[PDB]
Amino acid sequence: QLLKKYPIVWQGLLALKNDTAAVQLHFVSGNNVLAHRSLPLSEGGPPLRIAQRMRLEATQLEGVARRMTVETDYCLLLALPCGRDQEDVVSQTESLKAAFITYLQAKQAAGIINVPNPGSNQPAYVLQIFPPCEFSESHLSRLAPDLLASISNISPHLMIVIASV
């Protein structure tokens, strides 16, 4: 595949309400250090939980694009399903489709995860988790058109924008 150009930098579970999904996060563009710094340990710990959401509307999306203009201040990741065998993969993929993509599209929202530094109740990083949508297609077309062509309307996925705040 072409997922050697977009290496896996994190592997674990996402959570949303009472649902979970096993994913691999592929580095697309920006500053990979933000992924290492912002994402949790996945050696059996609690899942990465989406407990907030942001509307997919003009000023919200402008704010996300704002942090994406300099390569050191953001990280763009692509989330794809994974599992221990084909049967597990189908089930994890159905979870991603039904409990994450369908839900966020129906609410017209991106997931939001604020990541604090220990000792500070000010957010250090924000994870912005998009379903396939006009915004993700725009930026994936700009930054990784080969990757977008391989997944668009073909493979369920999420786009994750990590911003240091």
Partner: peptide, 6 residues
């Protein structure tokens, strides 16, 4: 701005 999930 944000809002909490269910």
């Amino acid at each position: 701005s944000y809002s909490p999930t269910s």
